[PDB]
């Protein structure tokens, strides 16, 4: 219940409260790595809500991006990559969008190592990633190119 | 040694930044302080000069007037009181 309240305050109206909640959640993960999966699940529980609101999901994606991953946490990384892709399809389906895509690409790049997902999953979004590379915000195109390079290398596409 | 003075402490202001209260060692009574009236005071590098004006209370504390008032951060700072102008 305490975690529910704390992660609920990610979607607060005031950006200061959301930032404080994100910082405290990241501190909580560091203090107790074992609850990292529970914290990530709780954050996912809000970001995917039908009434999530752009502020809440944006700060939640930031918090998920700033999580730390180890080479034995494939389940957590496999959770995070799928969550990022689901959110990406949710919002793709502009300036506010560009920042959220930047953060989502950052998260997918962070979690693409440590993630044992079939390459075919990324192949579905590959064209979409290229659509980002010519986007208005170059900060998104950098991360899109990073993701494209990583997927191409691991999947051994023609490149 | 070449000391021809007594190093005394600056206590506080009169309460008036113009007047300062000086505590001089080995002076328990106003009668003892009466000797030191008119002597030159020197707070020490830069030096500010002044003089002892009159006694203050029964503890032997004396009043003092400097050409420029002390900066108020010297309460408890060491201050010199020379023997000249001598009256003996």
């Amino acid at each position: 219940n305490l975690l529910r309240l704390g992660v609920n305050k990610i979607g607060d109206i005031d950006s200061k409260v959301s930032s404080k909640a994100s910082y405290l959640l990241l501190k909580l993960e560091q203090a107790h790595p074992n609850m990292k999966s529970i914290v990530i699940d709780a954050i996912v529980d809000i970001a995917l809500r039908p009434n999530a609101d752009y502020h809440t999901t944006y700060y939640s994606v930031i918090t998920l991006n700033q999580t730390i991953l180890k080479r034995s946490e494939d389940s957590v990384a496999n959770k995070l990559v799928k969550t990022y892709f689901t959110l990406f399809e949710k919002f793709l389906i502009d300036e506010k969008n560009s920042k959220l895509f930047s953060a989502l690409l950052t998260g997918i790049n962070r979690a693409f190592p440590f993630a044992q997902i079939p390459a075919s999953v990324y192949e579905v979004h590959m064209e979409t990633l290229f659509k980002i590379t010519h986007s208005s915000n170059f900060n998104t195109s950098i991360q899109a190119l990073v993701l494209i390079n990583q997927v191409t290398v691991k999947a051994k596409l023609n490149s | 040694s070449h000391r021809l003075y007594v190093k005394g402490k600056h206590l506080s202001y009169q309460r008036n930044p113009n007047v300062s209260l000086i505590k001089i060692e080995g002076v328990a009574t106003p009668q003892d302080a009466q000797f030191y009236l008119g002597k030159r005071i020197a707070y020490v590098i830069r030096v500010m000069w002044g003089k002892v004006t009159r006694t203050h209370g029964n503890s032997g504390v004396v009043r003092a007037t400097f050409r420029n008032n002390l900066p108020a951060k010297t309460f408890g700072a060491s201050v010199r009181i020379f023997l000249y102008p001598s009256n003996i």
Binding site: - | K9, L11, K23, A72, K73, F75, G76, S78
Partner: protein, 183 residues
């Protein structure tokens, strides 16, 4: 009269000792307090307990520091400077264990508090409020008292030597001629 004054805490009242020390610090004198655990307060144990509580640092030294800071205008530059001049300790840490320690008569409990009036020891208060170090300090104090007994024996021998030397100086002429002539 000394660059540094070491004041024993035993048998003193917190208010009077703190006031005297604060007055000295404001005059530039450097003072260090030791053996503050055995400091005394007037009243009964409960009343001081609830006073420190309605304040609620658990150590006796910190309680003394608060009491003294109440005198000094700490928020001013001068008050801060007076505060760095101060030092407080429970028991005697080095190197002050090798230095004799004065007593302030104005704050002495024996001279101030009337016989048959309840008082309170700061150590018991600090332990009751959550200071879990009164035990280690006591053993150090016992060792210090053994060392002090040895030092007292050495001082008695030194006083005997001083008496012998004073006798030796007596049978010299120049001092006797000087005293008769003047001084």
């Amino acid at each position: 009269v000394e660059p540094v004054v070491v004041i024993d805490g035993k048998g003193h009242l917190v208010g009077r000792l703190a006031s005297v020390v604060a007055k000295q610090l404001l005059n530039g004198q450097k003072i260090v307090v030791v053996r503050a655990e055995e400091l005394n307060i007037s009243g009964e144990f409960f009343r001081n307990k609830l006073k420190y509580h309605d304040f609620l640092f658990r150590a006796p030294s910190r309680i003394f520091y608060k009491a003294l800071r109440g005198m000094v205008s700490h928020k001013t530059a001068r008050g801060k400077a007076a505060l760095e001049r101060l030092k407080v300790f429970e028991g005697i840490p080095p190197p002050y264990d090798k230095k004799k320690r004065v007593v302030v008569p104005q704050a002495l409990r024996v001279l101030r508090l009337k016989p048959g009036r309840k008082y309170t020891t700061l150590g018991k208060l600090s332990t009751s409020v959550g200071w879990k170090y009164e035990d280690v300090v006591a053993k150090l104090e016992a060792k210090r008292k053994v060392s002090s007994a040895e030092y007292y024996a050495k001082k008695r021998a030194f006083t005997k030597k001083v008496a012998s030397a004073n006798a030796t100086a007596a049978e010299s002429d120049v001092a006797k001629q000087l005293a008769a002539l003047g001084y």
